[PDB]
From a paper:
Saposins A, B, C and D comprise a family of small, non-enzymatic lipid-transfer proteins that are essential for the activation of GSL catabolism; genetic defects in saposin function cause specific forms of lysosomal storage diseases. Each saposin shows functional specificity for the activation of certain catabolic reactions: [name] (SapA) activates the hydrolysis of β-d-galactocerebroside to ceramide and galactose by the enzyme β-galactocerebrosidase. Whilst they share less than 35% sequence identity, they all adopt a common fold consisting of four amphipathic α-helices organized into two ‘fingers’. SapA is known to bind lipids and detergents in a pH-dependent manner; this is accompanied by a striking transition from a ‘closed’ to an ‘open’ conformation.
However, previous structures were determined at non-lysosomal pH. In the absence of lipid or detergent at pH 4.8, SapA is observeed to adopt a conformation closely resembling the previously determined ‘closed’ conformation, showing that pH alone is not sufficient for the transition to the ‘open’ conformation. The asymmetric unit contains two molecules of SapA, both in the closed conformation, with the characteristic saposin fold. This is consistent with observations that SapA remains monomeric at low pH in the absence of detergent. Comparison of atomic B factors shows that the α3–α4 hinge region is more ordered in both chains of the pH 4.8 structure than in the pH 6.0 structure. There are no large-scale conformational rearrangements accompanying pH change, emphasizing the absolute necessity of lipids or detergents for transition to the open conformation. However, in combination with the structure of closed SapA at pH 6.0, this work reveals regions of conformational flexibility, and the crystal packing suggests a tendency to bury the negatively charged α3 helix at lysosomal pH.
Residue numbers in the entry: 0 to 80
The structure:
Amino acid sequence: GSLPCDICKDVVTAAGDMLKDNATEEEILVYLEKTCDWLPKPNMSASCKEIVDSYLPVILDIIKGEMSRPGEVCSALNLCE
């Protein structure tokens, strides 16, 4: 899969699991930012940050809306084919 697709799957899964543990949205952002910062290449970190900043908000809304399948959520947002 494309890099945006691969990152999206991570983000949606992470956000979903953390919400199911009643994590706060702020904490979720902090967690995902860490992931972005740990990625081994600058282009990966950059793509991760852009995806988190652009899509995490609506992803949280979608999961709260009872839709948490990573592949499906990401395909809908056109991050996956």
